[PDB]
Amino acid sequence: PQITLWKRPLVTIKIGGQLKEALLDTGADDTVIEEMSLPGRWKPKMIGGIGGFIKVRQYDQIIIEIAGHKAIGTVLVGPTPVNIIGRNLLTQIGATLNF
Amino acid sequence: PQITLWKRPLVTIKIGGQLKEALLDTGADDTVIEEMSLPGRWKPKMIGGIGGFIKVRQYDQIIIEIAGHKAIGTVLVGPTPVNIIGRNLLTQIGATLNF
Ligand SMILES: CC(C)CN(C[C@@H](O)[C@H](Cc1cc(F)cc(F)c1)NC(=O)O[C@@H]1C[C@@H]2CO[C@@H]3OCC[C@H]1[C@H]23)S(=O)(=O)c1ccc2nc(NC3CC3)sc2c1
Ligand SMILES: [Cl-]
Ligand SMILES: [Cl-]
Ligand SMILES: [Cl-]
Ligand code: NA
């Protein structure tokens, strides 16, 4: 598909058996999801943008389905205001910016 | 161009006759640039990021070139940790996400 940018590029994702809405975010290195349980091990991490830093849990090798497309990668879980699909997963679904 | 996402989508912008580096950011509604001088009056705005809010200065109808593409629109100036080109200007340069 081709997604215009007149409004926020929100898509449905499936993660951890749950459906969520998330933002396709080319300005995000990493994928950051609101609080949820995920299986396996994790380790703490600090990530920082506008307004400062938040503490998250880093889970590796997590399968996600993004707008119908499966990928695997690291997911960060914590108190983000918005669920964000970052470049680590956008690359895996073949997403590009075109102009 | 067609920009892949294996690295940050950084481009050169020109604003006020000066070149700067900025991030093409589909997760940003608005364009936010580090402290600089812009002409005219400004209005107040708050923008919510992952770590909290910053106050910024809103300047309207600013001439800005993004990767060689001319735009004229709203620029927010404040203590952002990187220069961000958001959807208000990505739409002016005809950018889409594709996969
Ligand atoms: C968090 C998103 C929902 C929103 N952000 C855009 C992001 O793309 C942002 C853009 C960004 C902001 C920043 F401060 C530094 C940076 F490197 C990139 N990424 C970011 O915060 O990522 C974090 C900082 C690292 C970079 O990527 C890594 O993985 C993602 C999690 C973190 C780390 S933002 O920068 O806070 C932003 C930009 C414009 C904007 N415009 C707004 N307008 C108001 C009407 C609503 S709110 C608003 C918020
Ligand atoms: Cl990853
Ligand atoms: Cl590729
Ligand atoms: Cl604008
Ligand atoms: Na894991």
From TrEMBL, chains A, B:
GO molecular function terms here? aspartic-type endopeptidase activity
One Gene Ontology BP term is:
proteolysis
Q: Which UniProt keywords apply?
A: Aspartyl protease, Host endosome, Hydrolase, Protease
Which SUPFAM superfamilies does the UniProt record give?
Answer: Acid proteases
Family annotation (CDD domains): HIV_retropepsin_like
- Enumerate the spans annotated as Peptidase A2 domain: 20-89
Coiled-coil boundaries: none
Q: Which GO terms describe its cellular component?
A: host multivesicular body; virion membrane
Q: Does the keyword Protease apply?
A: yes
Instruction: Tell me where on the tree of life, at the top rank, the source sits.
Output: Viruses
Q: Which InterPro entries match?
A: Aspartic_peptidase_AS, Peptidase_A2_cat, Peptidase_aspartic_dom_sf, Retropepsin-like_cat_dom, Retropepsins
* Compartments, record wording: Host endosome, Host multivesicular body; Virion membrane
Q: How does it sit in the membrane?
A: Lipid-anchor
Name by which UniProt lists this protein: Protease
Q: Which organism is it from?
A: Human immunodeficiency virus type 1 (HIV-1)
The primary gene name is: pol
